[PDB]
Ligand binder design. Structure first.
Ligand code: HEM
Ligand code: HEM
Ligand SMILES: *[C@@H]1O[C@H](CO)[C@@H](O[C@@H]2O[C@H](CO)[C@@H](O)[C@H](O)[C@H]2NC(C)=O)[C@H](O)[C@H]1NC(C)=O
Ligand SMILES: *[C@@H]1O[C@H](CO)[C@@H](O[C@@H]2O[C@H](CO)[C@@H](O)[C@H](O)[C@H]2NC(C)=O)[C@H](O)[C@H]1NC(C)=O
Ligand SMILES: CCCCCCCCO[C@@H]1O[C@H](CO)[C@@H](O)[C@H](O)[C@H]1O
Ligand SMILES: CCCCCCCCO[C@@H]1O[C@H](CO)[C@@H](O)[C@H](O)[C@H]1O
Ligand SMILES: CCCCCCCCO[C@@H]1O[C@H](CO)[C@@H](O)[C@H](O)[C@H]1O
Ligand SMILES: CCCCCCCCO[C@@H]1O[C@H](CO)[C@@H](O)[C@H](O)[C@H]1O
Ligand SMILES: COc1ccc2cc([C@H](C)C(=O)O)ccc2c1
Ligand SMILES: COc1ccc2cc([C@H](C)C(=O)O)ccc2c1
Ligand SMILES: *[C@@H]1O[C@H](CO)[C@@H](O)[C@H](O)[C@H]1NC(C)=O
Ligand SMILES: *[C@@H]1O[C@H](CO)[C@@H](O)[C@H](O)[C@H]1NC(C)=O
Ligand SMILES: *[C@@H]1O[C@H](CO)[C@@H](O)[C@H](O)[C@H]1NC(C)=O
Ligand SMILES: *[C@H]1O[C@H](CO)[C@@H](O)[C@H](O)[C@H]1NC(C)=O
Ligand SMILES: [Cl-]
Ligand SMILES: [Cl-]
Lengths: 552, 552
């Protein structure tokens, strides 16, 4: 019965009830006016005429490779373009943040309480007649039916962009520092109170956990040596709580910053690589600063690793998944003459869209072994048996699955996929098309337009009836991909703003931090500015195997 | 020991050790270069040449009233000047924040741990040969001797700016939402995790406390009615913890957001006024929104009261203490085309400088009574006996003491003033002159220059020996005042940056919050934009007595 249930205000106008059955739209700074903020100002009309579509911009970025090779070697132009990428994306994110699962209006509680994920769109109010507001049936379709018909994998569909298992596990490892759902409280709550790239998945969320993981000599993290190789220490040694099933013996209960990283050896591979990297940087800093104590060595190494992470995420990881011929750049100085907020709050919708389970293969192929999900999960003995070198060589060669395009979620994780649907509903997510509008995208007018195809589209129409009631999460996984691409339009145009804002919003990118002295001088600073996924592997994995996020 | 102990890097350059007995200065973005960041770039030379001193700017702002009267009535020019006041002041504050009591270098711990006050200047390292670094004697002078010789009141010295007890108690009430030292941890730690104007001193720091203070009908806060007058509810009724001696009568144990506010009736006066204001705003919003529930009424009223507070602080409180003929303005829109960070971390030095105990009179004069400190402390019966109307009338008439100029701290609070000195030392504060340099002020070259007189200067020279080892806090209280002013140069040039940044950094000032719908529509927004100390009192105090921050 909330008069704002229909989501009447357009173009980011805010709806407020003015009585039991009346509403008012606040069109402040939208560029539009009128009852529903749909009448454009003159300069807004000009902007809408000139603005190219995401599909047009994507086409330009993924063609003309010869022209981009030239542009990439003109620093002024590369800087200009990267600057526009950062600013245009970041403008789509509210900062300071606004809504959350419990607040569809701005409040001090929603602003101040860091235990909530924020919300890019407010929840559908509890008293609205339908799940999506006023459109659709009284109940959304059975999530098991949605899952089985259009999400579950029949035959494995490989990623045409050539993403590999190094990419899949990097995505999981990296994102799991800021997607840490507090299941005790609910799906709209997080345990990652840093709300970004703080490397708590290496160092621990709390000071007591950090201190249990630290050696307190030379800035270093605790470790063990097994057959001459460095691995994280044990739960027994450190008293650091981890999630393991009872059958895992004490010697295989590795303790790392993030309590869930014993789940799969792919996570423990990266946990081990980053642990080694921290201790490597400690050695470098000690060489430069014989006068420094353990605490400053530890803290400075952490800041360097934060920098390395952001560098690799932009110039290797995002570079790869983007598919662009343009060479992306990690350069905080690009924002120093721009309006930009050095802060971030993690959005629930960002968490939801990043459930990239179709990346996962049917089996995990290491050396000449093909491990099932059941064999792979909670099995660090696989890591010890093969070693990091073989893990990297094998993961670099193994292709990942396509995320968009439908029917590619492995059956082994069907319950996780269903949970993503169900939890979106619990959190009262607005529809796909509302989210499309929120990120300046044209609403889909049919299910065939969404999928680019007839079969799944017809299945969805029978389930949902109205395209305006289609849900965000399943839509991301069935969406028509870009040509030979891993993702469709909605994934990129939502994903990119959340991602780049989260990376550049870090305080190390602010002008008072982005200085050599922050990182122990020019040598420390250069570790950040020259970091890559290859360098990380080369320095910390025996033999310096070749690696990349693309299969060969 | 540490080669950075002498504070060699100038002009906000950062010092890093490069060995046991060698340092480097990082002059990045300072405008200077060379070993100590003292060689200016050409543009810096020009800016230095043209830039007027604070004393010259203060002169211009406090003279030429006829010209300012014209300026104040030309909106474009008033906006231009206020914009420059906000941006030039805020530029002096590091945001995101950097140092704290435990970290003299940037670290993730210092950035992320909200339990610390931040630091405008890093602490003097523990292994430095002297308290201030390398200058001065091995120990600072006896703090009791400094207190007695130059701080303690002989005869009451009234404020020549005419500040009254409404002003004094407003300062105390307002600032104690963000100065809440966690004495269990130490003077460098805070319990005010909002780090700004969140009105926790009305609503409680934690959700548990807030919920005990709330009525859960119509958005309102609980209250009691004594002699037909509204007062805060009791500790017994609410179960909220307050600090009171055990003998205080049950009905006089008033429970409010801030646990210390039973300390003096002056604080409880403002607590009662704001409580009434919250409930008054609830009534207004209920009339506008009969469809709204208790939670939205409560939250929206809180946001409105935050706005009212910022409005009153700038346009009444700061306006008064500034002494300027220019009419200051609370207008978030002034910053929308500027680079500005909507965040704040409370600085330890801001806490220290705001210990304005000389404001306090020898006795508290209400109606025909003159209460001693002993009679006034923890004595809410005084408030009940006289009533709010009489409190306002009396405190509007009673003059407060001068803060600068020396020898005006009442002996009744001598232990608090001594603690301010001792805790500054414990927190390893750098010297007055280092702080002056940090805020673009010229170092004092003698004690006579500091005080503008001979007697106190001579006592200080005998105690401290070197002007470069004079301490910040006692210096603020002995500094030569501006002509017929309450403060000297150092108080204004340090206080203003911290103050204005804390006010404008609030999320309600950000573009996504600063719109009518945030506050329940134009009716709510108007409450903020028309707020004043006179209207606060008129709306909530029987008989609408005249009030002001200056004696008439
Ligand atoms: C390696 C095999 C994997 C397994 C066995 C697995 C399993 C799971 C499970 C059981 C959950 C909890 C779901 C719930 O709350 O009910 C989860 C959450 C999640 N997964 Fe995976 N997953 C895997 C790989 C990946 C990959 C490659 C990604 C790509 C980024 C990913 C992204 C996520 C995200 C973002 C969450 C939400 C985390 C949170 O909110 O705490 N997962 N996964
Ligand atoms: C009215 C009588 C007042 C009394 C009896 C009083 C007493 C005290 C006491 C006992 C403390 C705690 C000291 C400590 O534990 O280290 C304190 C702190 C403080 N006082 Fe006052 N004071 C009064 C008025 C004022 C006024 C008018 C101001 C003006 C702003 C003020 C500013 C402060 C500040 C900023 C603190 C530090 C708060 C914190 O960090 O927790 N006080 N005062
Ligand atoms: C942030 O919000 C959550 C949700 O309201 C708070 O968690 C609740 O706190 C209340 C009051 O203490 C408890 O009674 C509930 O059991 C908590 N859990 C819920 C409702 O999920 C949390 O306290 C808030 N955090 C802060 C810092 O205030
Ligand atoms: C913020 O920093 C303080 C100071 O280091 C932390 O408090 C300490 O916590 C450690 C580890 O639990 C204890 O050994 C000390 O007793 C505490 N010291 C003091 C002075 O209180 C605090 O835990 C940090 N807060 C957060 C959120 O990490
Ligand atoms: C020639 C390529 C220039 C690089 C800029 C493109 C980076 C992504 O630019 C995006 O394009 C979309 C459609 O115009 C907009 O909706 C987004 O706000 C914008 O960030
Ligand atoms: C005529 C003055 C109108 C402009 C208002 C200026 C408000 C105070 O401006 C201050 O002046 C100081 C001395 O120049 C500077 O050091 C500070 O950075 C600046 O904020
Ligand atoms: C356009 C008008 C410019 C006139 C500016 C008057 C400058 C007054 O400058 C003087 O500077 C001294 C600095 O120590 C202070 O002690 C004096 O109080 C102050 O009057
Ligand atoms: C309220 C005063 C309590 C402390 C006073 C004793 C400390 C001695 O301090 C002295 O006080 C004299 C009298 O004011 C001054 O003439 C001297 O300059 C000063 O050194
Ligand atoms: C989380 O998912 C994504 C998907 C696509 C992205 C594309 C881009 C490029 C650089 C872009 O078009 O902005 C960035 C981040 C992205 C994150
Ligand atoms: C906390 O103590 C102060 C003292 C002086 C101030 C002056 C000003 C004016 C407007 C200024 O010169 O900026 C603002 C705030 C101030 C706070
Ligand atoms: C505003 O939207 C409503 C429904 O959302 C529609 O009926 C109405 O016509 C719109 N008003 C205008 C003036 O366009
Ligand atoms: C764990 O992996 C090993 C190989 O390292 C494999 O032989 C074993 O079967 C796995 N454990 C389980 C429970 O499947
Ligand atoms: C408290 O105030 C009352 C007047 O309201 C006064 O008579 C009494 O002396 C005071 N109590 C104490 C303990 O000083
Ligand atoms: C700073 O370096 C200068 C060189 O210009 C040197 O003369 C001076 O001694 C240094 N600083 C100090 C602490 O004197
Ligand atoms: Cl990302
Ligand atoms: Cl202030």
């Amino acid at each position: 019965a909330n008069p704002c249930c229909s989501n009447p205000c357009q173009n980011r106008g805010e709806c407020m009830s003015t009585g039991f059955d009346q509403y008012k739209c606040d069109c402040t700074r939208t560029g539009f006016y009128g009852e529903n903020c749909t009448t454009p100002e003159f300069l807004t009309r000009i902007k809408l005429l000139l603005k190219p579509t995401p599909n047009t911009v994507h086409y330009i970025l993924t063609h003309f490779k010869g022209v981009w090779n030239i542009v990439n070697n003109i620093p002024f132009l590369r800087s200009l373009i990267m600057k526009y990428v950062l600013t245009s994306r970041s403008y789509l994110i509210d900062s300071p943040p606004t809504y959350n699962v419990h607040y569809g209006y701005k409040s001090w509680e929603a602003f101040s309480n860091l235990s909530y994920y924020t919300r890019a769109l407010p929840p559908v109010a509890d008293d609205c007649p339908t799940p999506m507001g006023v459109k659709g049936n009284k109940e959304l379709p059975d999530s098991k039916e949605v899952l089985e018909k259009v999400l579950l994998r029949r035959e494995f569909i490989p990623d045409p962009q050539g993403s590999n298992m190094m990419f899949a596990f990097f995505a999981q490892h990296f994102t799991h520092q800021f997607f840490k759902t507090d299941h005790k409280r609910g799906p709209g709550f997080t345990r990652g109170l840093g709300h970004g790239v703080d490397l708590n998945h290496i160092y621990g969320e709390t000071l007591d956990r950090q201190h249990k993981l630290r050696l307190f000599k030379d800035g270093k993290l605790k470790y063990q040596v097994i057959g001459g190789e460095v691995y994280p220490p044990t739960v027994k040694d450190t008293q650091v709580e981890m999630i393991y099933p009872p059958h895992i013996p004490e010697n295989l209960q590795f303790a790392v910053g993030q309590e869930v990283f014993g789940l799969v050896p792919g996570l423990m591979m990266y946990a081990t690589i980053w642990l080694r990297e921290h201790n490597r940087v400690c050695d470098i800093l000690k060489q430069e600063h014989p006068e420094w104590g353990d605490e400053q060595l530890f803290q400075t190494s952490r800041l360097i690793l934060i920098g390395e992470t952001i560098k690799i995420v932009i110039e290797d990881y995002v570079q790869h998944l983007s598919g662009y011929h343009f060479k992306l750049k990690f350069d905080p100085e690009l924002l120093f003459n721009q309006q930009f907020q050095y802060q971030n709050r993690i959005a629930s919708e960002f968490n939801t869209l990043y459930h990239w389970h179709p990346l996962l293969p049917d089996t995990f192929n290491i050396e000449d072994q093909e491990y099932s999900f059941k064999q792979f999960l909670y099995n660090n003995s696989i890591l010890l048996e093969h070693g990091l070198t073989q893990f990297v060589e094998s993961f670099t060669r193994q292709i990942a699955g396509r995320v968009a395009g439908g029917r590619n979620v492995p059956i082994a994780v069907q319950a996780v996929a269903k949970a993503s649907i169900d939890q979106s509903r619990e959190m009262k997510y607005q529809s796909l098309n509302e989210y499309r509008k929120r990120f300046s995208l044209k609403p889909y007018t049919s299910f065939e337009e969404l999928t680019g195809e007839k079969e799944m589209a017809a299945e969805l129409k029978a389930l949902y009836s109205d395209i305006d009631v289609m849900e965000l999460y399943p839509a991301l996984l069935v969406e028509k991909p870009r040509p030979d691409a891993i993702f469709g339009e909605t994934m990129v145009e939502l994903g990119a703003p959340f991602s780049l804002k989260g990376l550049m919003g870090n305080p190390i990118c602010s002008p008072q931090y982005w200085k050599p002295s922050t990182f122990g001088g020019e040598v420390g600073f250069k570790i950040i500015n020259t970091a890559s996924i290859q360098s990380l592997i080369c320095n910390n994995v025996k033999g310096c195997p070749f690696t990349s996020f693309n299969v060969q």
